[PDB]
């Protein structure tokens with residue numbers, strides 16, 4: 240049903256290391272229906288080349304997805320996960336914090 | 340040692356003219372297959388994604404699928420028309436079996452409409468469910484009529500599936516046992532408002548999903564820990580974050596205890 244709203248969580252495959260290569264992860268979950276849009280941002284701008292896993296669902300039938308991309312952190316640049324779904328009025332964006 | 344096989348199907352109908360259905364199978368926690376609806380074929384994700392099946396048995400199944408995906412969407416649009424159901428549609432299927440020590444196996448087949456169960460396969464025919472809108476028996480009476488589709492499903496759950504899985508298992512031995520050691524590190528999470536902050540344990544890169552992470556500060560176990568969900572890493576491993584909310588005063592001496600299959604007896608411990 241159009242009632243379960245997505246839960247967004249952002250993290251790094253590796254310990255942030257300014258200048259060092261890494262992967263940015265965005266786990267969108269527990270939403271429903273499946274239709275949904277998700278972008279990885281770099282200072283507000285979407286990253287052109289990002290990939291995700293096959294969308295699946297949990298036992299409670301809610302869908303879940305993992306979007307990710309290679310990136311290199313830098314004290315100035317801030318990344319974030321932008322998500323849009325029917326259960327939400329505005330595309331919620333969740334920022335990435337190297338400490339959480 | 341939960342190594343069931345979960346074959347999931349997501350069919351989405353925007354209206355009776357716009358549809359898409361995609362699938363994927365999970366053996367234990369590993370996605371072994373992927374069946375997009377742009378491909379006329381089920382993608383193998385692992386070198387053993389074919390279990391013990393000769394390219395002939397596989398093909399037979401594949402066709403069973405080609406036709407099935409084709410026949411499933413045709414059938415859905417009709418039940419829609421008939422039982423008069425609004426059109427944005429969401430159908431989900433969860434079928435499978437998990438092989439047990441030597442002999443028997445259990446299997447399942449649950450379909451969900453609009454995020455909720457509505458029916459499933461019991462014994463040899465279809466049974467509506469707990470809550471299961473009343474119109475569902477209408478659909479069911481009909482389904483229960485198609486004898487072959489009702490004998491194919493059957494043979495599949497109690498017959499093929501197990502055989503398939505048992506194969507998948509032996510030929511997959513190599514990777515399901517695999518164990519990856521996680522690396523951990525600490526950091527402080529912003530203080531919401533107290534004159535105090537919050538600590539953060541970070542554990543990532545482990546394989547068998549099961550993990551134990553506690554902020555048991557004093558060597559003598561402590562409490563208050565706030566485990567997060569176990570998130571995935573596109574490299575088969577996972578990530579976990581346990582936080583604690585403390586007073587900076589005695590926030591010292593605390594510690595983060597990590598227990599995990601990959602680590603034999605060594606529980607990693609990081610002192611703040």
Ligand SMILES: CCCCCCCCCCCCCCCCCCCCCCCCCC(=O)N[C@@H](CO[C@H]1O[C@H](CO)[C@H](O)[C@H](O)[C@H]1O)[C@H](O)[C@H](O)CCCCCCCCCCCCCC
Pocket residue numbers: 346347348362363364372373374381400403404406407410411412414415418419424432433434435450452458478485486487488491492495496499500503
């Ligand atoms: C189960 C797994 C087995 C183990 C081995 C595979 C493991 C590897 C999996 C790899 C990835 C695959 C992803 C998993 C996808 C999800 C599982 C899908 C299971 C599909 C099993 C194949 C069904 C075979 C029966 C079928 O296609 N029936 C056909 C053809 O039947 C007709 O034609 C036949 C000849 O072809 C005969 O003439 C027959 O008499 C006639 O009626 C039949 O027409 C139906 O499409 C069968 C539907 C079955 C699901 C119904 C579920 C409930 C739906 C009702 C909900 C209504 C809601 C309304 C809003």
